Structure 1
Amino acid sequence: QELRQFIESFIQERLQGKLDKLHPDEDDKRQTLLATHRREAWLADAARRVGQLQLVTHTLKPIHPDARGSNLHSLPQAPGQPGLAGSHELGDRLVSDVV
C-alpha cells in the first residue's frame, strides 16, 4: 500500500543484478529467474530461510571458522570497581551483527 513499491523495486534490482551477473541465454534461464523473482515466491523463500541470530556480544567464529556453538545477544552489567572498563557501555549506541 504505502511502501510496497519500494520492496518491489528492491526485488526487481535483485533480479536485474542476477540477470546481469549470470547473463545466460540458453533454455530460458532468464525466464526461470523471472518465474521466481517477479512473483512473490521470493518472499516465501525469504520467510523460509532460518539461521540468522542477531548476536553482537558473542561471536564464536573468530576463535575458529568451523566452531559450532552458542552465540549470545546480551550486554553485561556495569562493573563496580574503578579504573578498568569495557564493552563501551556508556554511550555511542551500538550496531548489531548477524551470524
Structure 2
Amino acid sequence: QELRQFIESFIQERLQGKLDKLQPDEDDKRQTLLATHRREAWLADAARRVGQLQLVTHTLKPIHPDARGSNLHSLPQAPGQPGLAGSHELGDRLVSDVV
C-alpha cells in the first residue's frame, strides 16, 4: 500500500534493465518479459528462487569455488585469553554476507 509503489518501481527498474540490453529487433521476447518480470508472478518466482543463507563469518566459496559445502551464520564467542582478538566482534557492527 504505502510500500507497494516501492517494489513496483524496483520491478519496473529490473524490467527496463532487461529490456534495454536486449539488442532486439524480432522474435517478440518482450511479451514474455513483460508477462513474467512485471506482474506479481515475479514475487512467486522470487519465493521459488532459493539459495540464500545470510552468512556472517563462514563463506566456503573463496576456497576453490566449485565446492558445494556448508556455510554458517554463527559469529564466534569472545576469547577469554587476554591479548589477541579477531572476528570484528567487540564493536563497529558488521554487514552480513549472503551466498
TM-score class normalised by the smaller sequence: over 0.9
**Equivalent pairs, count:** 99
* Percent sequence identity over aligned pairs: 99
TM-score by length of 1: 0.93
**Structure 1 spans left out of the alignment, 5+ residues:** none
User: 5+ unaligned residues in a row in structure 2: which ranges?
Assistant: none
Q: Alpha-carbon deviation of 1:40? A: 1.2
What is the deviation of 1:30? 1.1
Larger helix share, 1 or 2: 1
In structure 2, C-alpha distance between the alignment counterparts of 1:23 and 1:44, rounded to whole Å: 28
Structure 1: which 4+ aligned runs deviate by more than 6 Å?
Answer: none
Report the Cα distance in structure 2 between the residues aligned to 1:33 and 1:69, rounded to whole angstroms. Answer: 34
Give distance in 1, aligned partners of 2:88 and 2:29: 50
Q: Deviations over 1:46-77 (max 9, x none)?
A: 01001101112111111111111111101111
TM-score by length of 2: 0.93
SS at match of 2:21: helix
Indicate the residue corresponding to 1:9 in structure 2: 9
Is 39-48 or 19-28 further displaced after alignment?
19-28
Query: RMSD across aligned C-alpha pairs, in angstroms?
Result: 1.0
For 2:97 and 2:30, locate their aligned partners in 1 and report how far apart those are by CA, in whole Å: 34
In structure 1, how many angstroms separate the alpha carbons of the residues matched to 2:43 and 2:80?
48
Question: How far, CA to CA, are the matches of 1:69 and 1:79 in structure 2?
Answer: 27
Map Cα deviations across residues 13-34 of structure 1 (whole Å, 9 max, x no partner).
1101100011323122111211
Map of 1:20-99 to 2, 5 A cutoff?
Answer: 20-99=20-99
- The 2-side partners of 1:6 and 1:83 are apart by 48
Cα offset, 1:79, TM superposition: 0.9
